[PDB]
Design a protein around this ligand. Sequence first.
Ligand SMILES: O=S(=O)(O)c1cc2c(O)c(c1)Cc1cc(S(=O)(=O)O)cc(c1O)Cc1cc(S(=O)(=O)O)cc(c1O)Cc1cc(S(=O)(=O)O)cc(c1O)C2
Length: 55
Amino acid sequence: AKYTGKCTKSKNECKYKNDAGKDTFIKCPKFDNKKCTKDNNKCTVDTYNNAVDCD
Ligand SMILES: O=S(=O)(O)c1cc2c(O)c(c1)Cc1cc(S(=O)(=O)O)cc(c1O)Cc1cc(S(=O)(=O)O)cc(c1O)Cc1cc(S(=O)(=O)O)cc(c1O)C2
């Protein structure tokens, strides 16, 4: 499943709702182009390949 969520800057985490609707918090990468740069920025998660991209 491909989901869109919101990331937090200080924890560099992506918050999204999983298959069941549960809030799920996962770590964005540190790499600049995939890290969270501002609270409530968009992030996406693909639950099959674990592609996590935070803005
Ligand atoms: O995110 S962490 O705080 O847990 C962390 C800190 C450091 C680390 O070396 C790593 C994680 C491992 C690591 C993870 C990733 S990731 O796969 O994307 O999550 C990437 C890197 C890495 O070392 C590569 C990397 C990227 C960047 S950046 O894209 O320009 O932000 C910078 C660095 C990298 O090694 C240098 C770096 C900076 C810093 S700093 O404190 O932010 O200056 C701490 C650590 C560093 O290795 C020290």
